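Quick one:
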Amino acid sequence: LVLKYCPKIGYCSNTCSKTQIWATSHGCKMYCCLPASWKWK
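Output:
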């Protein structure tokens, strides 16, 4: 679940709410948080 970078739609944080996908964005220090609505790969 690695992302080149955190999608503008979401926001990067040390931890993401369950609803949010814990998309690990390489382009960020912490995890990338995105709405469950967000489409992954």
